[PDB]
Symmetry: C4
Subunit: 258 residues, 4 copies
Amino acid sequence: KKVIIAGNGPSLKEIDYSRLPNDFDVFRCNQFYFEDKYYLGKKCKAVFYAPSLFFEQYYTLKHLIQNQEYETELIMCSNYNQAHLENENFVKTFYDYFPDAHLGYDFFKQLKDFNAYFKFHEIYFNQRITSGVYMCAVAIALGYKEIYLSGIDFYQNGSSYAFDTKQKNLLKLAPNFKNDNSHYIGHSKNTDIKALEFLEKTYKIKLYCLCPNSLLANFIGLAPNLNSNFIIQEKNNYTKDILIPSSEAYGKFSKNIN
Amino acid sequence: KKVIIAGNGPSLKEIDYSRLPNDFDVFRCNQFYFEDKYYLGKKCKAVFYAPSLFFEQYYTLKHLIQNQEYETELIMCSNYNQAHLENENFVKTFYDYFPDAHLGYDFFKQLKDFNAYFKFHEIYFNQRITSGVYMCAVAIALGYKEIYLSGIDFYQNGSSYAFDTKQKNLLKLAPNFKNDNSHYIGHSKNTDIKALEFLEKTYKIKLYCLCPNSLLANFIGLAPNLNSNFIIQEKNNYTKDILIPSSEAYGKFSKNIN
Amino acid sequence: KKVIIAGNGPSLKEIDYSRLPNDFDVFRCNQFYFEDKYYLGKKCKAVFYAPSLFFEQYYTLKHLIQNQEYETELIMCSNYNQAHLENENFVKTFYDYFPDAHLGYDFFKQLKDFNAYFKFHEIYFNQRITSGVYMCAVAIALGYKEIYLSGIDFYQNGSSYAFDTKQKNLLKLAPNFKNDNSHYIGHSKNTDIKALEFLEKTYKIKLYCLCPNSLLANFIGLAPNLNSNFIIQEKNNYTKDILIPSSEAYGKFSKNIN
Amino acid sequence: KKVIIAGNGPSLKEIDYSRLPNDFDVFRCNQFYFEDKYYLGKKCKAVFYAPSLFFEQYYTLKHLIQNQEYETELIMCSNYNQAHLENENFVKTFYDYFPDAHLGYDFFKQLKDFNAYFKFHEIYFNQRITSGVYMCAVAIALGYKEIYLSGIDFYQNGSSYAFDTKQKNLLKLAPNFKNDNSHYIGHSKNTDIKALEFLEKTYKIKLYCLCPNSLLANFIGLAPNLNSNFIIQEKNNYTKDILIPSSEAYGKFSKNIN
Ligand SMILES: Nc1ccn([C@@H]2O[C@H](COP(=O)(O)O)[C@@H](O)[C@H]2O)c(=O)n1
Ligand SMILES: Nc1ccn([C@@H]2O[C@H](COP(=O)(O)O)[C@@H](O)[C@H]2O)c(=O)n1
Ligand SMILES: Nc1ccn([C@@H]2O[C@H](COP(=O)(O)O)[C@@H](O)[C@H]2O)c(=O)n1
Ligand SMILES: Nc1ccn([C@@H]2O[C@H](COP(=O)(O)O)[C@@H](O)[C@H]2O)c(=O)n1
């Protein structure tokens, strides 16, 4: 199958749907569910969460599924086996706390050349790919060959996500969202582009751009027009903030955070 | 073979023996040996002990076997790979301290969907299945297809086991037994029933109820009447309290408790 | 092949050599090299050392081999995977510090029933088999079927080894040798005999006794008279004390002792 | 293929090139890149770095490759699984920090007899083979059969490398280079020679000497004259000091040093 990999940049709201492939899987990450409409449908092949709020995102995802807001086959933690990026015990006990999820690194590390590329840039130059690029790597390891990108906009003029992230619960869990620039300073356009180009060339897969007005389109060729249809389903009374587990839950998980 | 899984609720003493299957294995757990009569015979396929008193139960079981009070093929520790439920070193060194026993989780974790079901409810909602339900999961992983339940009564009106648990040694090892309600507050009827229903539906096995007067019978269909016979053998001068290992034994095991 | 397993009791010096099998391997343990004559030849199939002085015994063995006093194919550490019996890091890094040796437990644990037998008696009853019995278990795991025993005398009237153990270096490394009873209080005749009987019956091997005047002969049938010959080669200017590694060597090994 | 293994002794500059084999791979180690000319070409099959400065050497190597000063297929850390020789966490997380490199011990330990030989001499006698000998062992494990040695001179009259090692960055990272004798006191000619002889005899490979005026030639037969040609390419504006990673990089790696 073809895969659609979606960041949460503004271009998530400016997909050119006439270019949407006929039969695809969808990869979403992080606060994707803050979206005000189902820009890519409610069915996900995989959802990816950073290690830092994985405990609360997993909880929240279960509520989303129970609520029939989204479905997903795979749940991925976007880890790297780096002490500075993730809690060591969290990773060691992962499959025992989250038996229906995966460590994304199980797949990422299958791309040796890209693992090496990432680590060198991260460790020595503080140049860190974003989640969207990480999902691409995992897609490639899973055997996907045609990758359609959207919602990747390189944090222009602030973090500027495709939705309002200033929500009480997320702000309390992750105070970095209080300010306009909440993402890692080590991210950049060039870093993401160079990484994507490395992946395409190294693993001989194909990248397409679904959003013609995104800066991404200056670097990645457009998905072909197919005259596809898409009705964007609206959302109302939806989950638009992360949920906070009880203090008893935190206590049971306390060896696995910080 | 068919398996009979026995909790230690009052219904252990009100089995409808005309419904006992012809050829079965028996699973017992915890203080099963406190029973005043051999309500299910002295031959067990497996005995299951919680991690918390495993050290003393193993010792006690060896005495029971040496004494010809019970026989058993398998000895299981009912663990979950959760730091809040069990001592980490205990689990790591288990097969070296108890070479003829098993960690039950070796089998429980083979039921991925149920492992995930359990962990989510336990961690986030403090809803904990009971040992009887854990034995069912292990039975399923071992390949059993027809499961006959008894002694499961959901702790109605106190812990109310089928025997007197207020015994000197057990009270000293586990002071929680001093009070009428000694079991985990996180247990409940709904939690056990929902879990059992999940297992039956997910793994396409069959559950039966051996005790028509138990509340369990409101939820699980009765084992068919077969006109089976059973003479309940009495017990006298039997082991009705847990045994306490020497202080030298505790010293050797001290890295594996608390 | 048949194997001769030798403790270091007084009966080591009263082997009835007319009963020595025609083609055998020899297992020796601990301070075997303190012997004043080659009671079993200088060629060993295996030598076994307790964990406690393994570091110095390995060093000493290399000197014995370099000196052409003994040869051996296998070097075994007689471990049990018990924190109270052996240093944990020592066991974890063993093959990296001693690449041509083995942990005996790699073989001992292949005898599940006997592993369980040992652990239960050791942990709960403080009944500890001796090295001679441990070598028997390892012999069985290695596939030996006929086991000829000597030098097993149950520490009658003191530790009373077949040689003088009051040597400067051994006394400094292991002050317990200063007193007449230097062995573990948890050893006994009954414990060794019961264990040997368990092994013979459980693994359907054959035990023989090479020393007709040893108390062992009250329990184990005599090796058949074959009219075999044996000239006991004398030893002179031989290594009769353990060697002590340099303080630099101890420093490098310091994580692996105590 | 045949392999050329190069230490960084003065004889690196006195190779008899008429003896250079026709088709070979090249192994270099440590500060090899300090060389003022390409005494063995810019193409390496493998480069080996000691654990102590591996973090900075890896960084530096990437710059050398980016700069087209050298190429290499394999990057090896010359480790031994010894706490006194290398940082434990460094070794445990190695493949996650350096995904395109190898722990040399993965290969060294495949030579059991030599692993045992090394450990015994190192631990008990403080007799430590040099990197050149370590590369030979790894070459043998990789399947090389004909080994041509150069740049091995046993540190005569000081460490006396084939280049100036008194460089600001190396001196700051490794103050031992400030003095004329900066190498391990535990190295010696006899130790290296005995080890090389052990390897040749044990693994039935062939050693040759490329440098007729080196003391090595008193012990190892000369590579046959083949009338081979070689033009030594000069180096200018080359990297002649190790590079120092940023303080942010050190912070991310801080669990893996000291
Ligand atoms: N303005 C934005 C916001 C998010 N994104 C991308 O969306 C993905 C998910 O966002 P976060 O990793 O910050 O949660 C990342 O690739 C991020 O870089 C973007 O490209 N431009
Ligand atoms: N009154 C009781 C007592 C025990 N039981 C069940 O018997 C099994 C063994 O009891 P404990 O896990 O508390 O040792 C559990 O399933 C427990 O819930 C019950 O269902 N009702
Ligand atoms: N008097 C003795 C001395 C040693 N032995 C046996 O010789 C073997 C080696 O002695 P030690 O394990 O104490 O080093 C053991 O089986 C020990 O019990 C014996 O049986 N009688
Ligand atoms: N004067 C020298 C310098 C280095 N060498 C060898 O070059 C190799 C690399 O040097 P170092 O391991 O010290 O970095 C080692 O084998 C070292 O012994 C040598 O033989 N004589």
